[PDB]
C-alpha cells in the first residue's frame, strides 16, 4: 500500500462518457464533468486510507478500512455502499447501490496508475502519472 500513495495527475481517458451513461448520469451534467480533469490523492493515516479527487466541477473524498464496507456519495451524487480491498496487487472497489454494481480496479502499471471502471461490459480507462 506504499506504491499507491501520492498525488496523481490524469494523462489519458477512454470511454468515460460511456461508462457514465451506464451509471446513469444526465446528458448536460455528464458533459460538464467530462470536461474537467480530476487528479487523485491517496494517503494512509495509520490504517485508514483516504482517497481524494480534486476535479474542477466537484471535489470528493472517501476514508475507509481495507475490506470494511462503508457509505459514500460519489461525484455524480449517487448514495452508494462500497468496499475496497487490496486484491492481488490492485486496489479494487466495488460499489453497490439501487440493486446495481460496478468495479473500480486501480493497478500500478510501470510508473503509471491505471484505472479500469466496469459496469456491465461497458468499461473505461483513465491513467495517471505522479504529480
Amino acid at each position: 500500500c506504499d506504491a499507491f500513495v501520492g498525488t496523481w495527475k490524469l494523462v489519458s481517458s477512454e470511454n468515460f462518457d460511456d461508462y457514465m451513461k451506464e451509471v446513469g448520469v444526465g446528458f448536460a451534467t455528464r458533459k460538464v464533468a467530462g470536461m474537467a480533469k480530476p487528479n487523485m490523492i491517496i494517503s494512509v493515516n495509520g490504517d485508514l486510507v483516504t482517497i481524494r479527487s480534486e476535479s474542477t466541477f466537484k471535489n470528493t473524498e472517501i476514508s475507509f478500512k481495507l475490506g470494511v464496507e462503508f457509505d459514500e456519495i460519489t461525484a455524480d451524487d449517487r448514495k452508494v455502499k462500497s468496499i475496497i480491498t487490496l486484491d492481488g496487487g490492485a486496489l479494487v472497489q466495488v460499489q453497490k447501490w439501487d440493486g446495481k454494481s460496478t468495479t473500480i480496479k486501480r493497478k500500478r502499471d510501470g510508473d503509471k496508475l491505471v484505472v479500469e471502471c466496469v459496469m456491465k461490459g461497458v468499461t473505461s480507462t483513465r491513467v495517471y502519472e505522479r504529480a
Partner: antibody
Amino acid sequence: QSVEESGGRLVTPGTPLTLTCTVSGFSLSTYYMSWVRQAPGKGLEWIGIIYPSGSTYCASWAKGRFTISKASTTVDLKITSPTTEDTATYFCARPDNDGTSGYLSGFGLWGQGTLVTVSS
Amino acid sequence: DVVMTQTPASVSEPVGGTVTIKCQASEDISRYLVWYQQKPGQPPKRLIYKASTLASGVPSRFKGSGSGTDFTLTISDLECDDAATYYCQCTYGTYAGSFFYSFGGGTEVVVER
C-alpha cells in the same frame, strides 16, 4: 543555479544552426530543460522540453523543424532548416516542481537569451 | 496543442491602484498555471505558480486566482517597478500523448503617473 545560451548568429535561410545551453549548479540527470523563443516585440513561444531520461516533447508546429539533444552539462537545440520566421531570441530555461526536479511549477531559471537572425 | 488566451492585451492604471489580467485555457488544465513578469530585454521572472502559490521573494500584492479554465492575476498597490508585460503559461504536462506548456499572448501593463 544557472543556465546560459550561446551560438546565435546570422545564418542564411536553409543552413542548419545549433544553439547550446550550458548549465552549472545542477545535474541534467535530475532536471528537465526546455527551450523557449521570442521574436522581437512579440510573445514567448515554447519550443519543447527534454526530460532527465532523454525523452523529448516539442510543440505541435515545432515538430519537423527543431530537435533537442543533451550531453553532460549542455542542452542543444538544433534548428533544422531555418526560415526568416525563425528569427528570434532563444531563451533556455529550467522547469521545476513544488520545490524542485519536475515541471508543473514552470520555469524558475532562465538564461539571458541568444539572438538568432535568419536572412540573406 | 492547448492554447492560452490572455485579456486584455494592454491596460493602464495609476500608481497605488489595481490591475486585473485574465487567462483562459482551451481545455481544462486544473490549477497548473504559472504567471511571469517580463521587463524589456530581460528574461521573464516567475511570479505565481500552481495558479495561486507565490514564488520566492514575490510580494503578496500579486494575487493569483482561478482553476480549471479561467484564471486571473491581480496586482495591487501598483508600484512604478510593476511596469512590464505579464505572461501566463499552462504547466500541466503530458496529456493524451501531447505536452501542454503553452504561453499566453501576453498583457502589457502601463503604470500612470
